[PDB]
């Protein structure tokens, strides 16, 4: 393809895109690209550009674990939109290397899901929703440097950020302007 050819040429320049919703297919190819780029050269930065409406928690936790366990520093770039798992992986970049492009908008909100089945199933989904929500808020409190009480309070409904508001809040470390 052409779109795959341009992404392949940026993969040679160690630039990978999270440009869709974070489902398991886009997460596995990003985890594959991070493992491929960390094996190719383990000292150069990987530039991950986020244009994402967010997606699955476990898909983004796969990316986040692959970002952390890579010996490379994953530079993240809020490119237009970093909503949900997109803001998470944005803020999951290497400290000092989390960037927002100046008109990117960062959406922060508690995870969405769905309860189904019997009341014993839903009681276990609810226990696990409380575990996921506590862990997502703990990591956003670790990324942004905000207290977990403020992360939980702001991620009650949708909490939108501009690039300057995300810089003050702690998702990104710089707003690049050239």
């Amino acid at each position: 393809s052409l779109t795959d050819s341009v992404y392949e040429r940026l993969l040679s320049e160690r630039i990978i895109f999270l440009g869709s919703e974070v489902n398991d297919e886009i997460a596995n190819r990003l985890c594959a690209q991070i493992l491929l780029l960390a094996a190719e050269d383990a000292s150069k930065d990987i530039s991950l550009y986020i244009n994402s409406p967010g997606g699955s928690i476990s898909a983004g936790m796969a990316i986040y674990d692959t970002m952390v366990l890579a010996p490379c520093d994953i530079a993240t770039y809020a490119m237009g939109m970093a909503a949900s798992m997109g803001e998470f992986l944005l803020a999951a970049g290497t400290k000092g290397k989390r960037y927002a492009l100046p008109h990117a908008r960062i959406l922060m909100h508690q995870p969405l899901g769905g309860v189904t089945g019997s009341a014993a199933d839903i009681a276990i989904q609810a226990e696990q929703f409380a575990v996921i929500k506590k862990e997502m808020f703990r990591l956003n409190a670790e990324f942004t440097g905000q207290p977990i009480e403020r992360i939980e309070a702001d991620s009650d409904r949708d909490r939108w950020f501009t690039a300057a508001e995300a810089l003050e809040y702690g998702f990104v470390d710089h707003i690049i302007t050239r």
Binding site: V115, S118, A119, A120, I122, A123, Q125, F129, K133
Partner: protein
């Protein structure tokens, strides 16, 4: 008209899936037979597959409200909400036909409901108090410990009428009258 002659002889026929509209009909019928003769026993025939918890507790509270004793008779099936309504009859007047099936199981969301996790902690706290209320109701009427019913309604517990008598859902398995 055979449903009128049931109702003229004070027999409320449940019959269908317990939903809002089925619950609305029975509460209309439980209170009219309450007003016609509050000292004469209302009979409730149950052949329902259940469903609905607020429709359950609409029928349940109304048949507990009325002055008349409710004679619950299970015909071929009392599942979910209907087995609770079957136990909701007055003690000594809870009946079942010999090949009727009593199916007790914990409340369940039919289909996924979406939402934020704060929305889903409340929909899960709701079905948890739907579950405890189903077990507290079924413990008042079966004489069990309500943790026993939680162990028993963990899965679908199909009761034959002879072992719904031993469970306490019904009080009498109906003997046949064929004069033959």
């Amino acid at each position: 008209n055979p449903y009128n002659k049931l109702f003229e002889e004070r027999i409320i026929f449940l019959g269908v899936q317990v939903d809002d509209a089925s619950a609305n009909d029975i509460m209309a019928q439980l209170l009219v037979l309450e007003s016609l003769d509050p000292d004469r026993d209302i009979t409730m025939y149950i052949n329902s597959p259940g469903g609905g918890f607020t429709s359950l507790m609409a029928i349940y509270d109304t048949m507990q409200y009325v002055r008349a004793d409710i004679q619950t008779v299970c015909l071929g099936q009392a599942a979910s909400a209907a087995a609770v309504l079957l136990a909701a009859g007055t003690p000594g007047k809870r009946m079942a036909l010999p090949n009727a099936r009593v199916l007790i199981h914990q409340p369940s969301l039919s289909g996924v409901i979406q939402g934020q996790f704060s929305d889903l902690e409340i929909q899960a706290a709701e079905i948890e108090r739907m579950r405890t209320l189903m077990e507290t109701t079924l413990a008042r009427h079966t004489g069990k410990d309500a943790g026993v019913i939680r162990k028993d309604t963990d899965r679908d517990k199909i009761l034959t009428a002879e072992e719904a008598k031993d469970y306490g859902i019904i009080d009498t398995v109906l003997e046949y009258r064929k004069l033959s």
